[PDB]
Design a protein around this ligand. Structure first.
Ligand SMILES: [Zn+2]
Length: 961
């Protein structure tokens, strides 16, 4: 009845909570398709996943599939303009990205719901007739080179590639997926290769309809979505490509029983333990690898981690199955390492094998399976509604692995108890199949090997056969017990009836010296979940570097202490977040509401009566020291942002000040700090979800009463509720602050054009301008000018003040970067003068959709309110208000705003620039086809942050709504 469709699927199993409608189908050309209809969605979305990636890169052109991914965005026969795609999305409230894994290339976008077809049509052409334009290729190669550059000095990426380097060199696993200028341009030139043709060959070879899945989400009916997907995708050609497979493991015989000693960039201490395993993917109905992951990676009483931590050897552990590709997987057990732990690796691994032996001795446990199965069933039933773009991306990828009818449920619902598989996998976790990697600065100078792509310094040794034996004879350790029943498993899921006096926004339901309580019963999502957000104010968390250190250590020690007990809550979908802030403390509790009161109470009770284990204090202090030091290894652009925070905020302690003050933190001194901190507080809370007003008032009073009882807490004076201000820059001023990054060989720059206080009008001026310049900026400064991978523009908001910021990471020096941004600003003004009245209105419309986009899930809506509360603006109806005003703005208003605040000769330009110089750059000046960059004034070089701040006014704070 339709030659274009091979088959429609049966019912797609969904959560009964889920109001969205679904249809699976397979096209005649073999594209597997999931259609999602949500007539309420603000943004629509599509994604396509090709089952080809890096593992299929030609051996002579490393990174070609990743390069292909970049290239697809840059013009097709039907839509030749390099930025037609991104520009269209931008003008219609959409966004887009893509990634390349070993076996996948995944492309996705969202757009205003009214413009699905326009978006999707442009999108489809990626997979039909890409141009791979000659000039785009030459340019885009730098973006990829830049992508790789930032990864070079990153410890995760180095370990990632090092593993691949130390397996079978013949195996596709050993390939370099990212690529760079060398692999994508330099080497290929030297070798007579036309990469444009190679891109064409590759696309044509592997971009076969038979290796593709597509997911589309929109307001349209399932039938309309069907016609649409047929109309645009049934013309993709079926080239019948065999799906690549890797049945032989990249780790063979001679790759096992190997030790690797590795030098990190950061001062980190890690042990990596790895076993080769078969592909467990097909066993998705039982997840035997996850069963063992769940047990070996447990953190409750009796667990592997518990003992390792008690012995003061490790702080954290990750265990479980790790993805490989079709035909191979890994099982891992990874831990960080204390100083002591570094000298006891052999015992740690013994304990690991002892725990595994316990699992053998006990045999597989149906009740453990049953518990996971139940938790997963609940998780799936009450899953939060996803944002469309993440969802379509995810589904496109998993359409390759499960029957149509099962795509939604397959990763959640367990069906089979499989003691056989559990033992089969367990039988592979043996010392004769082990790989051990130690990462420590102590191997500095003691290595004899260098990994090609990153330069990673390492050494390789056979593990002594006697050590293997010691591990093989590991017997039972009395310290290791399986976890017992999980008491935190929720059973009460009733959604409370919507109260008579319920409101659309949070209501101030308690206003006392001790606490401000904001409250909202959920009127949208109707899942049995809640958010309990608390802000504790104390001047003593940030009075000086010492106290800041102490606030941090206190809360880290608290969390470390609670970890065992809290682990079960987390498995049961009840988690918490607890950290020190520049104003005191922040506590959030979220998840199923049923057992929250229990977790919260244990938290507050513990913090009010805390007793510190000295062993733990020393270990945590030491890790915190390294943590601070390790900032020197963050990326230039991150340093840039850091220095701006420091320059523009009234009060801010530097990482240098914090670490210098850290040696003065003694056990006696901390014990004294805690009661001090807790003795006077103000609390501002937002309780939001499946809870009544009486429950909310009840919870708030419980928190207070616990503090009063155990810590004697009294209220804080209203005048002690100190918010910090932002530095007020002089009209027509320009400051430059300059530092060097000693790890990375790239530059970073942040340029901040401060405007004025936040307000309806000032907000929308800035925001409209950012909307208009957003993609032109990416297009000019990255795509055309290829300055770097990281090119960013948009609003800066802090302390109630705002402005325009640019952030770039580049191999080019900041003074050069600077003039290009300035050049760009002028382009934008002409551009704004040149654009139609409609083109203007389209941008108003796009920002309007962006701002009005409704949160899909409780925590997202909660987050919007929390922003209103923590900023002390309390403007819960901001979106409607600000959009109404947005629609009033004319082209002329924006031109004036720019001329008055932003232009190079603007009367009220307030400019700060942070230059972060590359490792290899000695000094560097602060000032200096392509568009015209204007002449700039001499900047005032900031010599000292304190003096700079002392010499300027401070802005007012914003007035509450
Ligand atoms: Zn990329």
């Amino acid at each position: 009845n339709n030659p274009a469709i091979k088959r429609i699927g049966n019912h797609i199993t969904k959560s009964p909570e889920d109001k969205r409608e679904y249809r699976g189908l397979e096209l005649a050309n073999g594209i597997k398709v999931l259609l999602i209809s949500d007539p309420t969605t603000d943004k629509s979305s599509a994604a396509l996943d090709v089952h080809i990636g890096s593992l299929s890169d030609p051996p002579n052109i490393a990174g070609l599939s990743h390069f292909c991914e970049h290239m697809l965005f840059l013009g097709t026969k039907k839509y030749p303009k390099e930025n037609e795609y991104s520009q269209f999305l931008s003008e219609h409230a959409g966004s887009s990205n893509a990634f390349t894994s070993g076996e996948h290339t995944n492309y996705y976008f969202d757009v205003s719901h009214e413009h699905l077809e326009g978006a999707l049509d442009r999108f489809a052409q990626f997979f039909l007739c890409p141009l791979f334009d000659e000039s785009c290729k030459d340019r885009e190669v730098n973006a990829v080179d830049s992508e790789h550059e930032k990864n070079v000095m990153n410890d995760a990426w180095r370990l990632f590639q090092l593993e691949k380097a130390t397996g079978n060199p013949k195996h596709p696993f050993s390939k370099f997926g990212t690529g760079n200028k060398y692999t994508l341009e330099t080497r290929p030139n030297q070798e007579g290769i036309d990469v444009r043709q190679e891109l064409l060959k590759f696309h044509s070879a592997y971009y076969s309809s038979n290796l593709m899945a597509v997911c589309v989400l929109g307001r349209e009916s399932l039938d309309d979505l069907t016609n649409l997907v047929v109309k645009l995708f049934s013309e993709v050609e079926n080239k019948n490509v065999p799906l690549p497979e890797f049945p032989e493991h990249p780790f063979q015989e001679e790759h096992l029983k190997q030790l690797y000693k590795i030098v990190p960039i950061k001062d980190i201490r890690n042990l990596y333990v790895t076993f080769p395993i078969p592909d467990l993917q097909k066993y998705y109905k039982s997840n035997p690898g996850h069963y063992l992951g769940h047990l070996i990676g447990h953190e409750g009483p009796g667990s592997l981690l518990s003992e390792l931590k008690s012995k003061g050897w490790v702080n954290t552990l990750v265990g479980g199955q790790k993805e490989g590709a079709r035909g191979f997987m890994f099982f891992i057990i990874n831990v960080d390492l204390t100083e002591e732990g570094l000298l006891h690796v052999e015992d740690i691994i013994l304990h690991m094998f002892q725990y595994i032996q316990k699992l053998r001795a006990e045999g597989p446990q149906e009740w453990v399976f049953q518990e996971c199965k139940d938790l997963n069933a609940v998780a799936f039933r009450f899953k939060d509604k996803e944002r469309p773009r993440g969802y379509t991306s995810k589904i496109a990828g998993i359409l390759h692995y499960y029957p149509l009818e099962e795509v939604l449920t397959a990763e959640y619902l367990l069906e089979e108890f499989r003691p056989d598989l559990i033992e089969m996998v367990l039988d592979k976790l043996r010392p004769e199949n082990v790989r051990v990697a130690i990462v420590s600065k102590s191997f500095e100078g003691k290595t004899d090997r260098t990994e090609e792509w990153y330069g990673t310094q390492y050494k390789q040794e056979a593990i002594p056969d006697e050590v293997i034996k010691k591990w093989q004879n590991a017997d039972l350790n009395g310290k290791f017990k399986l976890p017992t029943k999980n008491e935190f498993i929720p059973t009460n899921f009733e959604i409370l009836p919507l109260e008579k006096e319920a409101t659309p926004y949070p209501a101030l339901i308690k206003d006392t010296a001790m606490s401000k309580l904001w409250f909202k019963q959920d009127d949208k999502f109707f899942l049995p979940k809640a958010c309990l957000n608390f802000e504790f104010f104390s001047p003593f968390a940030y009075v000086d570097p010492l106290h800041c250190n102490m606030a941090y250590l206190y809360l880290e020690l608290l969390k470390d202490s609670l970890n065992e007990y809290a682990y079960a809550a987390e498995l049961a979908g009840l988690s918490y977040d607890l950290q020190n802030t520049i104003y005191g403390m922040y506590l959030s509790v979220k998840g199923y509401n049923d057992k929250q009161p229990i977790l919260l109470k244990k938290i507050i009770e513990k913090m009010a009566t805390f007793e510190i284990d000295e062993k733990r204090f020393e270990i945590i202090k030491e890790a915190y020291m390294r943590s601070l030091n390790n900032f020197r290894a963050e990326q230039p652009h991150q340093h840039a942002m850091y220095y701006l925070r420091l320059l523009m905020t009234e009060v801010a302690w530097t990482k240098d000040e914090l670490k210098e003050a850290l040696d003065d933190v003694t056990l006696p001194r901390l014990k004294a700090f805690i009661p001090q901190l807790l003795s006077r507080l103000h609390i501002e809370a937002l309780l939001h979800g499946n809870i009544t007003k009486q429950a909310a008032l009840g919870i708030m009073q419980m928190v207070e009463d616990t503090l009063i009882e155990h810590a004697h807490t009294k209220p804080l004076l209203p005048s002690q509720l100190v918010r910090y201000r932002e530095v007020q820059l002089p009209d027509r001023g320009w400051f430059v602050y300059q530092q060097r990054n000693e790890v990375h060989n790239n530059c970073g720059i942040e340029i901040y054009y401060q405007t004025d206080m936040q307000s309806t009008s000032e907000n929308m001026f800035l925001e409209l301008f950012c909307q208009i310049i957003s993609e032109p900026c990416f297009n000019t400064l990255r795509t055309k000018e290829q300055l770097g991978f990281i090119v960013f523009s948009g609003p800066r908001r802090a302390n109630g003040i705002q402005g325009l910021r640019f952030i770039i990471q580049s191999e080019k020096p900041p003074h050069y970067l600077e003039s290009r941004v300035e050049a760009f600003l002028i382009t934008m003004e002409k551009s704004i003068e040149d654009m139609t009245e409609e083109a203007f209105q389209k941008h108003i419309q796009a920002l309007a959709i962006r701002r009005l986009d409704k949160p899909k899930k409780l925590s997202a809506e909660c987050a919007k309110y929390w922003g209103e509360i923590i900023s002390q603006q309390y403007n819960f109806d901001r979106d409607n208000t600000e959009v109404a005003y947005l629609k009033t703005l004319t082209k002329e208003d924006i031109i004036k705003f720019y001329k008055e605040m932003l232009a190079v000769d603007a009367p009220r330009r307030h400019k700060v620039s942070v230059h972060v110089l590359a490792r290899e750059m000695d000094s560097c000046p602060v000032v200096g086809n392509l568009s015209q960059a204007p002449a700039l004034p001499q900047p005032e070089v900031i010599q000292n942050m304190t003096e700079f701040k002392r010499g300027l006014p401070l802005f007012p704070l914003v007035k509450p709504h």
